[PDB]
Design an enzyme around this catalytic site. Sequence first.
Site, mmCIF file in Angstrom:
data_model
loop_
_atom_site.group_PDB
_atom_site.id
_atom_site.type_symbol
_atom_site.label_atom_id
_atom_site.label_comp_id
_atom_site.label_asym_id
_atom_site.label_seq_id
_atom_site.Cartn_x
_atom_site.Cartn_y
_atom_site.Cartn_z
ATOM 1 N N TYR A 71 36.526 39.889 35.428
ATOM 2 C CA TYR A 71 36.065 41.185 35.939
ATOM 3 C C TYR A 71 37.029 41.742 36.952
ATOM 4 O O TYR A 71 37.368 42.890 36.838
ATOM 5 C CB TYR A 71 34.631 41.090 36.494
ATOM 6 C CG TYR A 71 34.224 42.136 37.494
ATOM 7 C CD1 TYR A 71 33.869 43.423 37.099
ATOM 8 C CD2 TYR A 71 34.163 41.846 38.855
ATOM 9 C CE1 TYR A 71 33.509 44.420 38.061
ATOM 10 C CE2 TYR A 71 33.812 42.810 39.784
ATOM 11 C CZ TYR A 71 33.428 44.081 39.402
ATOM 12 O OH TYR A 71 33.072 45.028 40.372
ATOM 13 N N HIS A 74 40.077 43.021 35.335
ATOM 14 C CA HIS A 74 39.870 44.010 34.269
ATOM 15 C C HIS A 74 40.297 45.438 34.757
ATOM 16 O O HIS A 74 39.913 45.856 35.858
ATOM 17 C CB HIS A 74 38.414 43.934 33.811
ATOM 18 C CG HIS A 74 38.096 44.765 32.599
ATOM 19 N ND1 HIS A 74 38.304 46.121 32.562
ATOM 20 C CD2 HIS A 74 37.587 44.428 31.388
ATOM 21 C CE1 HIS A 74 37.919 46.598 31.381
ATOM 22 N NE2 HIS A 74 37.480 45.592 30.648
#
Lengths: 103, 103
Positions: A71, A74
């Site tokens: 995450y 990302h």
Amino acid sequence: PVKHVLLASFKDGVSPEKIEELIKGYANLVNLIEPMKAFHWGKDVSIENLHQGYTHIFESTFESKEAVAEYIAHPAHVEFATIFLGSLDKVLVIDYKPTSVSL
Amino acid sequence: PVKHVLLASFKDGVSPEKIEELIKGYANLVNLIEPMKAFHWGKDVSIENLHQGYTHIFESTFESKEAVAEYIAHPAHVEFATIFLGSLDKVLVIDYKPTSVSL
Ligand SMILES: [Mg+2]
Ligand SMILES: [Mg+2]
């Protein structure tokens, strides 16, 4: 699994409207980012005067420590974080694996 | 309903053993205090360097804002809080009603 907790204070001049816009955008990362599985938030309504200037809490759920790392790396997180962090005074992040007194 | 979140830093010289003792005591307030319904905790394992010196998170669940207030006024809380707070450097409390982007 792993709960990703972000506490925030919105800077002077951020409207309540811009806050709800920002919160909808943060929550949308569930949709944009595979590893982020759920999102909840709250405004502080404590009475103890121990909030240390933070007014909001954001909790996102992940399946692992590695999923949180994915995450953070990302590109949709990196893009949106500039937007969101641009409107904050204070920020605090803690990740934990919920533990209880269990047998 | 209402999640009661306490973030902590244990002071210099508090052992890992005293920490686990303290955490078992905090968790026991579920049993001692009617309004407190559940208890979970975690040590921070974040990677962002945004934890602001806090190392642990404690989340307790309540059915209402009034139930949290009853907890704070409960003599078993008042007694135990002296013990627990005596071993802390930093403390931060936020209460929130979990909110999500829902229809
Ligand atoms: Mg996702
Ligand atoms: Mg109880």
